[PDB]
Design a protein around this ligand. Structure first.
Ligand SMILES: *[C@]1(O)O[C@H](CO)[C@@H](O[C@]2(O)O[C@H](CO)[C@@H](O)[C@H](O)[C@H]2NC(C)=O)[C@H](O)[C@H]1NC(C)=O
Lengths: 223, 62
């Protein structure tokens, strides 16, 4: 996250880290045994880490749970990142507490202008590398579709939304992918892609979660 | 085995600036220049933006 702030402890209890030796993507806990992340974050084996404050230290109050099933959207396109959503079933149910909690799926799509919270352990600099140990947060609004399409001509599908600032300076970045965009208590975006990070006229692009609630429910119901 | 930067979507600007659009996953790779790049797409974008021709020495971090 570039241009954000250090989240307060337990502020973002639904945030998870996806680990395959080291942190590589974020994700969001939606119920005791299911995590939502980005399809491009797919790996054959994944350890889900929950309740983490500092990803470099083991404080005893986190939970590490292996993925048992990893299901990428059937129409995911690895080249354009359309349908960039994936579900992870945990090997065992997480124990929910003050540090590990869930976020609601969206009851309706977010309108342009709605204020959201983006979080993650990704790069905090636009040029260069600097990875925080502590989870970063950023408040940013959903942009209009026309505004998003004009920033990335011919690259935005109906399953994508822009969230951020056209003036640059604040955005999600490498290491944030899969992470949440929560607006009014509902998960409306998945960190997906962009032209670099925090570049002018090039806000981040996020999977439009409100399009996928029926697929999520059907998949979960049967698995 | 090197790498294919075509695997990533690109867009041309008004003045001909080619921009490579990258996913935000942290999957570090080690360049032939000995520098660790955040992911392969970012190495691709660096080469395009700087005009270099760095390759991938190996999928991990240097
Ligand atoms: C940029 O223009 O995007 C296109 C689309 O991926 C790249 O075009 C392709 O992939 O280039 C490869 C050879 O490198 C060729 O085999 C593919 O057919 C071709 N596809 C099309 C639609 O032309 C293009 O290379 C890329 N530009 C850069 C500099 O990365």
């Amino acid at each position: 996250i570039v241009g954000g702030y250090t989240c307060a402890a337990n502020s973002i209890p639904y945030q998870v880290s996806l680990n395959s030796g080291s942190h590589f993507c974020g994700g969001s806990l939606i119920n005791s045994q299911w995590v939502v992340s980005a399809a491009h974050c797919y790996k054959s084996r994944i350890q889900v880490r929950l309740g983490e404050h500092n990803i470099d230290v083991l404080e005893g109050n986190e939970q590490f749970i292996n993925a048992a099933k990893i299901i990428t959207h059937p129409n995911f396109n690895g080249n354009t990142l359309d349908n960039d959503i994936m579900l992870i079933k945990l090997s065992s149910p997480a124990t929910l507490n003050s540090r590990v909690a869930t976020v609601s799926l969206p009851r309706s799509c977010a309108a342009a202008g709605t204020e959201c919270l983006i979080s993650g352990w990704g790069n905090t600099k636009s040029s260069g590398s600097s990875y925080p140990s502590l989870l970063q947060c950023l408040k940013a609004p959903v942009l209009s579709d026309s505004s998003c399409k004009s920033s990335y001509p011919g690259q935005i599908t109906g399953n994508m939304i822009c969230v951020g600032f056209l003036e640059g300076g604040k955005d999600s970045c490498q290491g944030d992918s899969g992470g949440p965009v929560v607006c009014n208590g509902q998960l409306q975006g998945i960190v997906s892609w962009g032209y670099g990070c925090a570049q002018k006229n090039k806000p981040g692009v996020y999977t439009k979660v409100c399009n996928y609630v029926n697929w999520i429910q059907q998949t979960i119901a049967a698995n | 085995v090197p790498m294919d930067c075509s695997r990533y979507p690109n867009t041309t600007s008004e003045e001909g600036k080619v921009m490579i659009l990258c996913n935000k996953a942290l999957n570090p790779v080690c360049g032939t220049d000995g520098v660790t790049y955040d992911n392969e797409c970012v190495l691709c974008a660096h080469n395009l933006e700087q005009g270099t021709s760095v390759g991938k020495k190996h999928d991990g971090e240097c």
